[PDB]
Amino acid sequence: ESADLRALAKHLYDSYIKSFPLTKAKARAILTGKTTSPFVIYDMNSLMMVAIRIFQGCQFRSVEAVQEITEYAKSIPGFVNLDLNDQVTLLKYGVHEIIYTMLASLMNKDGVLISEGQGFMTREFLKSLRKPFGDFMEPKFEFAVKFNALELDDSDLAIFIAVIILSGDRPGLLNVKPIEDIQDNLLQALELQLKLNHPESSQLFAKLLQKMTDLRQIVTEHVQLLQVIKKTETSLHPLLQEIYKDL
Amino acid sequence: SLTERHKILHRLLQ
């Protein structure tokens, strides 16, 4: 213990560096201009240089991200030993929550990096898209500004998204006992990592744990928002289709 | 049946 909790934190950090193209450390340096500059999209004209266009182009990276999160999951110790049915359940209910955590790293009060940092879409432009598309991103922006004020780094985020994947209360899970015993161990790694990485923030663990329920409700409110589109807006990628069905 | 109702996801896991 403890020495082994630190080994697991390093293992997850390594895996996370290997699976995801844009770290929070790079994204922040791009957002602050400290890097040695992305194209800025603020209207239709700067985009082509419409809400459906954004909406469908967003599916592109989303499909790729489910693949990256799935690979990161397969590296979580114990994960590939679980019943393969429960592996599907954890990824089905976790991928969107992980997208929104990683999306926060690419966000500030004023907009969001896109295409691995080669672009910056402004919050004003997103909020100005025709209803109901204009409201899709605002709940993500208000969660991102609160979550970024915790000031986690990638080494913290590696264990945090592992904790999100291994949730024992997902619907349909066949055998929760082995899932819960991995998460308890990851929660222990996260608690210790935050003590080491932020010895000054007394209750950062407690603050962080409460964000996990915030994510769950962004996904709930997103899904309800997307049902209206499908009803009133006449495509979706089959892998997004398979994740959203009965979700 | 989870792996049968999620063929793309199931294949990304194998």
Ligand SMILES: CCCCc1nc(C(C)C)c(CC(=O)OCC)c(=O)n1Cc1ccc(-c2ccccc2-c2noc(=O)[nH]2)cc1
């Ligand atoms: C409906 C949900 C909205 C999400 C979303 N919203 C936008 C804007 C319209 C607000 C864009 C821009 C965009 O493509 O529109 C083109 C004009 C966007 O792609 N997604 C999908 C997305 C998926 C995964 C990641 C991700 C995840 C884990 C690690 C890393 C990354 C990552 N880091 O950099 C990347 O490119 N992906 C990031 C973004």
